[PDB]
Structures are given as structure tokens and as C-alpha cells.
Design a protein around this nucleic acid. Sequence first.
DNA 1: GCCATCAATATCCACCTGCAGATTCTACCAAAAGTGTATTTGGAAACTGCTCCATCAAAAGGCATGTTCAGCTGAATTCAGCTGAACATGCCTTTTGATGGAGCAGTTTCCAAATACACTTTTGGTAGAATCTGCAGGTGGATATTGATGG
DNA 2: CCATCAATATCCACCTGCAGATTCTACCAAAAGTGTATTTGGAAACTGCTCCATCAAAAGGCATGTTCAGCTGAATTCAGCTGAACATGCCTTTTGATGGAGCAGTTTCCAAATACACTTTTGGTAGAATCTGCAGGTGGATATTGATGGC
Lengths: 98, 99, 84, 92, 101, 94, 513, 105, 106
Amino acid sequence: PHRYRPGTVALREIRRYQKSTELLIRKLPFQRLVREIAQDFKTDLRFQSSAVMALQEACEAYLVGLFEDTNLCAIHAKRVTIMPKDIQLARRIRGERA
Amino acid sequence: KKPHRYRPGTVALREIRRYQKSTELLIRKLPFQRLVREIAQDFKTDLRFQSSAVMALQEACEAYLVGLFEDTNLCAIHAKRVTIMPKDIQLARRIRGER
Amino acid sequence: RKVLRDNIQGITKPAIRRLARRGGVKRISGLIYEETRGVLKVFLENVIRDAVTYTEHAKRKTVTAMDVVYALKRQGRTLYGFGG
Amino acid sequence: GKGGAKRHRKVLRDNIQGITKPAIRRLARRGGVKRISGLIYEETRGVLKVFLENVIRDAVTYTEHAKRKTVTAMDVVYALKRQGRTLYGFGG
Amino acid sequence: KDGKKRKRSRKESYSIYVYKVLKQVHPDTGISSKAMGIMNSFVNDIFERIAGEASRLAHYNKRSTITSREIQTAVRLLLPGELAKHAVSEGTKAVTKYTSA
Amino acid sequence: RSRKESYSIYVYKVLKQVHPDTGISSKAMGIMNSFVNDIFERIAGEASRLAHYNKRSTITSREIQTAVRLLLPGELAKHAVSEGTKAVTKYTSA
Amino acid sequence: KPEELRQALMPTLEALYRQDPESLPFRQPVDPQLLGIPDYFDIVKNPMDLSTIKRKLDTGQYQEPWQYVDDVWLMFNNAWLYNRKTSRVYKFCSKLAEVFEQEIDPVMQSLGYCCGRKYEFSPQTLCCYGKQLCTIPRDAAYYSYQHFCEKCFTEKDQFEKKKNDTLDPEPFVDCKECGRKMHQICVLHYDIIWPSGFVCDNCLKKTGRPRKENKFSAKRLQTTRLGNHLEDRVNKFLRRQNHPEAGEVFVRVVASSDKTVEVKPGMKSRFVDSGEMSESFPYRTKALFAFEEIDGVDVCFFGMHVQEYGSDCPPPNTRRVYISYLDSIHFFRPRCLRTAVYHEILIGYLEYVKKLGYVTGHIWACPPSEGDDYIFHCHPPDQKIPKPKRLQEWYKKMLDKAFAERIIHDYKDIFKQATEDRLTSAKELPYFEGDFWPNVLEESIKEKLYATMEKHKEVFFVIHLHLLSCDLMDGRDAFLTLARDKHWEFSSLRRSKWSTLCMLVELHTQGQD
Amino acid sequence: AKTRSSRAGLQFPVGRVHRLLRKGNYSERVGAGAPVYLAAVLEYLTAEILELAGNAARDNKKTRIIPRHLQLAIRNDEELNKLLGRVTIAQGGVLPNIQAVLLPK
Amino acid sequence: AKTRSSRAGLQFPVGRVHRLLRKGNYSERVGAGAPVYLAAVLEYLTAEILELAGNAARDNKKTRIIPRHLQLAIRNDEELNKLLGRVTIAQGGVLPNIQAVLLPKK
DNA sequence: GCCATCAATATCCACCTGCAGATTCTACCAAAAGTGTATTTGGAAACTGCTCCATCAAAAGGCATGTTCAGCTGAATTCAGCTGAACATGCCTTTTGATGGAGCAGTTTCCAAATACACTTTTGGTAGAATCTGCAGGTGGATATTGATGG
DNA sequence: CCATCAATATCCACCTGCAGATTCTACCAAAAGTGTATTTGGAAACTGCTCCATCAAAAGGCATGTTCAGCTGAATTCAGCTGAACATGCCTTTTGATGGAGCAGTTTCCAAATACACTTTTGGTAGAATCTGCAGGTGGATATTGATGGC
């Protein structure tokens, strides 16, 4: 059976998703989460489709930028696998936590 | 007969406490007015400096450096180390976005 | 309206893996998925709180993309293509 | 003139070198740094140097607008404000 | 004496008001000039921040007047729960007292 | 319905000037309109702040030029200043 | 002899050497090549240093020590001139010079000379001639030939352009017997007083007869009832105090005449043409001065002028006295009674006119501007100029003290007095020569009067109480001009003594009676 | 008769705030209650910041507020910490904080 | 019958941007040359970014500018990247960038 | 390897005392600040036209979810070259105080330059239909890329 | 380890259907611009007052060299974590249609904001004189940590 060594498919999809720009998180789970937490803030609210698209794109950009920060922080410790303390440090440097 | 010598770190921790409990400026004055004078004349020749403006610049620079230094210490201790390294300051400046 | 809940798991493991790959991450740990879900969630209540307060200031019950642009701009995360 | 025109003319120190490395060590102690690598100081010099053209130039760019050549505390504090590092106490 | 050499530079400052507030909150506590400048700068920059938020709230919704609701929502944006609720309560009390005055 | 102005036609004219055979999508037009509106708001607000700082109640070319210098770095700033001087000279020459 | 001069002058010079590091640059002659100052000889024509002084003393090249003093001051001036005030050498020279004054006097006082200081008069200001009214400004470019201002000649190149910075040295006298050079001010010798020449006290000690009595003293000046009353009151107060440092005080009126004040053209047209008041108001002017016995000589310490309108003067000036100018010197002994003495003068005047029948007195309490001398030229630099509030408090204390003795019936300010009198026209204001109010009214006519009174409320004081011909003292201008021309300064005790002696001689010999 | 600040029971000047709003070019028209609410909000924030500054001073055995006490007060309250988190404080120093790895043993 | 936009030799409407300046509540008064300068700056920025976007599209064998082309233009110009460092382009993506360490370590 | 403890040290505190800095009191006044009156107006309510916001049907293929094996990556352990920490030594550079004038601000004039607004003309959105067009998407095969197969 | 080879993802040219980009016809109200009228921000000249650069001494530090305990990375080994692959199936994603809650346009109009005009108070500023919080200076003194030493 043909099998690729670990990391080859991961790097292939790294170029694949760095080449394309389509929305990468599927829509309605994000829509439903937004609806739930907004109802937690305020009930009986309504949402435009463009508004949900804007939320999705902004959150994707925020998480992906956190992901380059994550890779830099991880390779900072001579590592190629990411663990939560990496983004914790990244956010505390960014000022998001402290 | 073997004059008294503190181990590496005890005096370092003492200085940590001393400079975290105090608020006086740490950058010497006259070099700072010099630096601002040459760097300002690099943009506009024959500038004049107020004492308050220089004090504000010095305080802002010290605050920026000290905060970047906790950032750098955090980056260093993240790598299972105690000594700050140029990769630590580069990572801190990259994450801050200034680079 | 129905009181829906527990859709934070809707941010699937392959989706978070894809987002990490787009960010240049080669190897991902197990708890990364859920803890980045938490970080995403936090950003979500912050942004929607700002947007919903914007909308309530306008005496509207429908959240528009324009107030979303307002919230992103006021959070230092300005977004283009949706107005503003 | 004559006499006293040779007061501390050892100008043989670079402008960036005037940061007085023990002051950098003091700042690190205030920053909670326990151990410092030997060649760190100079790069921090450059780093702080960068911050200066990040800040003072802005204030300097203010100066010609008011038809002045003297930088004031208001120019400095507003240059800090526009850069996201607002300062208190020099707004009088 | 026209063109008096003493002074004509009336500098806007909230010093006496901050001192009075210190008196109500702490009658037997002093204050330094540098700390007073810190207080003046803090209250100032908070003023421009809140005024800018109110102005943008008015502008974006095609509203040409800044009213109490604008500053209500501006405070809600700028301040999280505890500070926001306390500030809203005290401001509502103040405006109610002013209206009933 | 309420009129909603946009800079689509001016951007189209500019891109014809710089690229006669290049088109743009509607989403690209939205991105460009958002960018121009955001930079307009930023530099106009900086000019307003600069006018307020010097107790000045009018936005003229000098303070808006200074604000552009503050926000635009380097080569873009020099090009903007030079083109603005040329444009104001042309405007006042007629 | 060189030996005595050396044994005298080594202590002060060695004390100058003791100062370090101030005296280090003065150990050797200035070398332009070594110091890199090729322009040193372009500015300093005759340089000298401490080593030159030592070598010149060691060879006995001095026959009298004033050459030593002149050389030391000349090298001090060279050091001050070539070097900038902020430089090392300037302040080093200042410290060395200060040590020089601190050390020179006791040494040279034992060698048979009056003192050891080099004295230079204040910069003598000149006066214009084309305009006959303006003067030559000090420390500025001036025009002169064989003197004009910068704006006089402008409304051909033979003029000489310079800046007024020259100084006048003190006059020197040579003893007819010894020949030693002496300061004329220090020895208090004057040619008309002593036509036989200047003889030092040492020579008169070899003769037995001391210096003959000076007939040109303040005591022998013509006495007047007002001056006699003032001097009697001052002497009685001093006797009651019985201060050991206090001396006899002589008050003499040296000038008295009758003049008229003319209404200025604006008020002449506004009020004189209608005939409600006369064109001019007659009055009597008097000048009195106070002299005290200090160190065996008379010292002038007070001067003041009055204008007296009698009962025949038309209103509103009828039966009034006005204090025009007031001046004083703070060298009175003791200082603690100085102020207390001044009261006893002016209060004594206020009572005296009260005995004559005068009803109203006027005081213009305005502090002098810096550089403006009222009566005495060259006020001492260390004499404090009182603040206007201080001067008002001083006058209020005077009026309260006089009220305590039941001499003054009341005292107010001009604004409150006008409000109480229900004055409705500016014509009711008193008219005095050179007074501020006539000029204010003229300015108002040229272009709110009660507002002007209120602004200067504390300046003017109104007091309710109920011939010697001398051209020199007929007004404050002639005496000031003569003092400036003859360098009659009151800046120091010895200079004040010399000026008092000169003015007493002038009054005694140049009078018109 | 009564000042707008007194009518609202506020120490801060309502009229001065309204004048600043007029000159600040935030809107050509300003509501009547906007300066009152601004005065109340700034009074509130001043009240707790000075309260915490006095608490820090009395914990530091001091009776005069100094910028060190001001930073100790502002940083120790996490909400107040984020209010001035992107703000540089003069003459305040830093909080006493040492990492676990830095401590001996 | 000459418009002030054509009078200044600019493509952007000076009148509209001046009206927006007046409506923007920046001060009590607005100078005459300020809208001209503002329009010139805006047109220069849009011209530069559109030229870069067209170059990127040509590099991608594309003749229609898409948000991906705009993102490529904004990110590959360090000055323009500094201009838009805190702004997200919708449907723009990220630059292809893989660290050397991420590459195989054979 | 633990730890109980002579001994030098910086520092907390018990105290203090003089001074720069903070606090108290009297007085003037232009600058706001409060109140009165006529004017203008932005937005409240009232009703309604209308766009998209929310909601239910259906199906089938794109990934979502679960399981397995192991490649190798993260984690723990030793240790040795060595870079920095602590410290004594020498001296020099910094800090504080005093002093000319280069410009920071206050006063006055007046003109090129800014609003207010009533028209008139050009012009930028834009309902609506028609033609043009770049690339979404599927096909097929030559082309690198990866991994471990014979030896 | 260097060489070939098989399984596999990639590039890419090509061709077809179409939502979207581009071209006109006509419309049309919102601006744009010209020409008076009115007002004012500020150019420009002259000048008093700050305070900033320059220069001095007194002093609180900074710059080098030495010794070495401890820091960091290279080398080594290994448990198990997640990547690659695959099977099963979940739910997706669109295309479609629909009732109506809700967004927004239009009309009316009034309490609220504004522009003066006048009277009232009042925070700034300057100078005098009183009060004091605390920065250090001096006497212990105290964990405290490195070191000597005993178990």
C-alpha cells in the first residue's frame, strides 16, 4: 500500500489553502453559534446574510493571523507542533490577555 | 580568605526587586538629550527642545523598552530558558506587529 | 425563537486543522482544536456585543453588516467589502 | 577663547552607544529579566533608536506646522497618542 | 496698563474639581502636582475618547445631534459590565436630578 | 429609495487610465470603495485633530498635507505631497 | 624703598596665589602659540601676569604702590576683556579680584595711603545740542565732534561713530611736601577750601597746627524758621533716642522763590477762556536739605521740594502745599532710626505750615523708575527701590504717626476725597507744576476721569490739616546736571561725603545773596 | 441662580464640558443632558481611581498621592488595568512581578 | 462651465469630497484647496493599488481584478502593507509563505 | 545529600528633622456661566410600501466522524564548552547651577480668503433591456514529486 | 547510498454553460458651479517676555579585567501523539417557495436646541505667609544567603 510520510500531506494542504481564498469554516455552525451567543446578549435579534459573511471573514482572518503567530512562537521553542501555551504567549504579547 | 561572593542570580533578583519597587528614571539624562538632538536634526536642522518634551520622550522610551522586556523575558522562558536571546526580541516585535 | 445551544462543537476538527494549515502550521496537538474554539468564541461575544449595542443604538432589531464594520473598525480589525 | 575649551572632549563614542549599557541592564531589571546575553544591549539600542524615529519625527513633523522650530511637550504627547502609546502628565 | 506683562495665558485644567473629588473620597489625603497632571491628562483623554465615540454614533446613523442615548451607547461600547452599569446608574441619577431641578 | 453614493465610476476611470484592458469584479469594487473611504476618514480625522491642536477652525492644504505626511510613510508621502502641490497650483492658476 | 614695598605687597600676592584652580592660568605669561590663541595680542595690547609682577617687585621697579594696583587691575581687565564671561578665565579673574579687594585694604592702609582700591566713576552720560531737550543714550552708538543723538542729525561724513562705554577715573592729588598720590575723595581736600594746597596729616603732625576749620559747612548756611524747626525736632528726637552712632543733623533751606504755574493750552481753552479761573496761579517754591555729622564731616542724606499756594491764590489751589519731589540717601547713622528720622522731617513740615495757616497738603507717592534720579545723582546700587505698595504703607505709617500727635487732622486718597467732596468737574482738581493730573487732563482733552482717579487711588495722598535766591537749587534739573557734569555721586559713603562737600561749597560761594 | 453642576449635584463644570463639546466639532448640535452625563461619568471614574490611589497610598504608609500609587491603583483593578493598558504612565515604575522560573530553588 | 475637479486636473470629484468634508464635522470651516489635495491623494493611492493589482492579476494569467489580486498587491508592497496592517481584505487570503524549517529536513 | 547555624548585607522599619512642595487665606477680574426671549429645527408619532429576514421540503455527495498503525516528534536525561554573573579597581562622565540672546508669545492692520444663499447647468446614480465576455468547472494526459522497491 | 522505478499529486491546455461584468436608452433629483453679499482666519510688522543653548564646578556614578558557578545546547533514548490512510455515513448545499416580522419612505408638527442680550459667579493668576510628607541621614537588626561545618 502506498503511504506518504507524515507531514507531506500536511504541507501539500498548506500550499493548497494558502493558494485559495474561499471561506474555510462552514457557514451555518458559525451562524448558529452567533445566534446563540447574541441571544445570550439580547433575544429576538435578526441577522443579515452580509453581516454573517463579514463575521465569518473577520474571524477567519483573526484566527489565521493567530496561526502565523502560533507557528512563529512554536518554532521559537525549537518545535514544529503547536501547543496552547504558544498562542497564550502570542496573545499576551498582543495584549489580548495581559 | 575567599572574600564573600554571592551566587549568580541572588544579586540579580535583588536588582529585580529594587528596580520594580522604584520609579526613578534609569536612562541617563545627558546622553538622552544628545540622542534626541541628533535624531531630530536628522529630520530638521537647528531644532530646540523643551525640558518637559525631553522628559516625556524619556519616560515613553523607558516604558516601551521595559514592556518589550517583559515580552522578551516571556519569550525566553517559553523556550525553557532564563537568558534573553535576539530571537526572543525578534519574536516579540513580530507578534506586536511593529516589524 | 428556539433556545439553541452547544454548537461551539460545530467548529469541526478538520475545519480548525484547515485554518491552521492556512496559517502555516504543520503539526497540531489534540487540545488545540477546542482551545482555539474557546479563543474564537471569546472574540465572537466581544464583536457581537459591540455590533448588537450599535444596532440597539439605532432602535433596530436586525443586525446589519454596517454595524459589523463599525465594530471591527472600533476593535482595530477593520474589514473591507461590507461597506464603510 | 582660551582655557576650558577642552572640557570632556572624548567624543569618541558612537551616538547609539551613548545608551550606557548599565542603563539597559537597569531597564531589564525593571523588566524582570534575570539573565541577559552579552550582545543584546546594542540591538536594543537599535530597537530604541527605531522607536525614536517612530515617535519624535511625528512630533517633529508637528513642529513646522505651528511655524515653530521648538518641540514642545504637547507635540511629544500627541505624537505618542497617534502612535498608540499615550502619555500622562505632560499635557499642561 | 495695557499689555500687562504678568500673564494672559489662561490654561484650561480640571485641577480644582479633581481636588474636590479627592476631598469627598478621601478628606485626609494629599495630592502631588505630577499626580494632578496625571489626573488632568486621564480625564482629558477620556473626554476626547467618549466624545469621539458619541460623535461617530451620531454620524453613522444620520443623526446630527448628540443626545443622552448617544452617550449611553458610547459608554456601553467603551466600558464592560461593572463600570458601565455603575456609570450609567450615576449618570441617570444626575440627569434625572437636573431635569427635576 | 435613498441615494447611496459610491466611487465606482472614478475608480473605473483610474484603472482604465493605468490598465486599459483590465477589469474588476463587484467585490473588488466594494473592497476598493471601503479602502478609499477608510483612508479618507483617517487622513481627514488627522487633519481635523491637527487643526484643533493649533486652535485652527479651517482645514486648508497645509494641515491636510501634514496629516498625509504623518500617515503615509516615505515614497507614498513624497508623491502625495508633490502631486497635491501641483494640483493646488493648477486649481489656483485658473 | 623696594624692601618696604616688597614686605608690604608679598602677603596679598601670595594670598592671590593661594586660590586654586582660579589662579592657575595666571602663573605664566599668556602664550598665543601654546594656547592656540593668535588673536590674543590683537585685543590685549599690554599683557602681564603674576610672574611678571613677582619679577618686577623682586627687582625694585616700583617707587610707589599705586603702579602695583594699576597693573593688577589692568591685567584683571585684560583677562575679563579677552575671555567670555562664561569662560574659565573670566570667573577665575573675578574670584582673584574679589580676593584682591578683601586683602589689599589692610596692607596699604599701613603704608601711609588712604586705601588700596582703583576707583572708576559711572559712565558719564552726555546731552544733545541740536534739540536742546534730548540727551545722549548710554551703551549705544552716538554722534560727536570736537554730541548728537542717532536721530538728531538725520533730520557729511566727518562725524565719528562710537559706542558710549568709556569710564572716568577718579581725580588724584599730589601732596606739596611728600608728593604721594592720594584720592581727592578719600582725603576730602578741595582747592577753594584750602588755597594752600593739599598737605597730608603726617606732615601736619610734624607742624602742630592741624587742618584749619572748614567755613563751607552746612552749619554756617543761612538759617530759616522752617529749617530751624525741622532741625530742632530732629535733634530732639535723636536726643530722646540717644543713639551713640547718631550725630547732629542740620536742616537748611537753601533756595526759596515765588513762581507761577500756567494753565496748559487745552485747559486754557476749556476753562480759562470762559474766565471762571485765572490764566496762571502764583505759588512759593522752597528747597530744603538735611545734613548729618558722620566721621567728622557733613553728609547730605535728604532732599525734598514743596510748592506753596497762599491765601491769595485763586481756587482750587487756595491755601495748599504740595510735595513735588522727594529724595534721600540711606547712609544715615544709625539705619534703625533712619526711617524714624525721615518722618520727623516731613511731619515737622506738616505741623509748620499748619502753624502758618495752610489747610491742605498733597503727596505724590510714586517710586522712581530705574535710572531716574530725583535729586541726588547716582544712587547706590545696593539701595533698595521700594515697591509702590511699600511706599504707600510707608506714607500711611507717616500719616498715622503724625495723627497720633494730633498734628494731622485727616488723611485720605484723592479718589475718596473727590467722592466725599462731590466734585463734578475736572476744573476743581488742584493745579501743581509738573503734576501728573494736569497731563492726564490734557491727554483726556486731546482724545472716564473718575476711573483714572480710581486706578491711581493709592498713589496720591490728600491731607487735611485743619527769599533765598539760588539758581543752582531752583529746581531739581540744575543740581542734577551739575552733579552729572562734575561726577558728584552718592553711590558710596566717601563719594557721598565728597559730593556733600562740593555742593556745600557751591551753595556757599555761588549763591546770589 | 443655581449652576448646572449644582442642579445635577456634580462637582465637575457642566458648562465647561458643554463648551468643549461645542468647540470639539463632534456635532453642530449638542443635547442638554450630554454635558451633564459627561460630567457624571468623569466624576465616577475619578472617584474610583482616586479611591484606589488612596488605598494604595495608605497601604504604602503615605498620605500624598504619587504616580507610583496611581499605577499601583490602576493596574491592580483588571478593568481599570485595560482602561490604561495601551497608555503609558509617567513616574510610575512597574508592578512587582517575578516569574516562577526566575525564583531560586 | 468648468468643474473644479477638471480645473484641478483630477479624476475624483472635488465637489463631492468637499461636501463629505463639510458633513464630516471636522471644523467650522473648510479651505478651498483641501478637497483638491484630498482628491489627489485618494486618486494616487487608488492608482498605485490598482496598478499593483493589475500586475498581480497578469502574473496569475487573469484580466479581471479580484479581492485575491488586491490582497496580493497590498501585502507585497511593504509601504502599502504598513498602510493596511490592521485591516482585513474580504476574500483576500494570505500570501503563500512556508518557513524553511517546515520544509522536509532530509 | 540535609540542614542547624557563625557571619556580612541590603533592606523594613522605629524615628527625625529640614525643606521643596503642598496647603491655607485675601484680592481682581475677564471668562465663562446662568437666565430671558424669539427663532429654527431634528427627530417623535402615525401610516404605510416594500425588501429581505426568517422558516419549511428534499436529496445526495462533500467532507464530518470514527478507527488503526506507526513515523517521528515531543519529552526526559547527561554533560561539557562556555558565556555571562558577581565583584574589586580606577576615573570619568553626568548632574546641578549661572548666564547671554533666538525665538515663543501679545498687539494691531487689513486684505486675500472664507461662508450664505438664490439660481442654473452639469452630472452621478440608476429602472430596464441587450450584447459581450473571463473564468467556474469537467477531461485528458504530460509533468514533477515521493517513497521504497530490485540490488 | 546513488540509481531506477511505480504510485500519485500538479500543471496545464482545452472547451462548454452562464452569473456576472460591460454598453446603451432614458430619467431625474442631488449636487456643482457662477455671481453677489457678508464676515472673518490669519498674513504681516513690531515687540516684551520665555527659556534654551552654552559654559562652569561638584559629584555619583560608569567602563575593564578576573574568577567561576551555573546556563544552554549538542548528543542520546524512548513513550506515545498525531499524521496518513480508509471505511461509514452526516449533514450539506443548493434550489425552491412562502408567511410575515420588520426596515424604511412620507407627512405632520412640537418640545428641544440655538442665537444673541444681559446679569451673576468664579476659576485663573500673582504675591505672602504658614504647614508638612517625606527624602534621606543615623542608630540598630534581621531574614538571608553563601559558607563552614556535622551527620
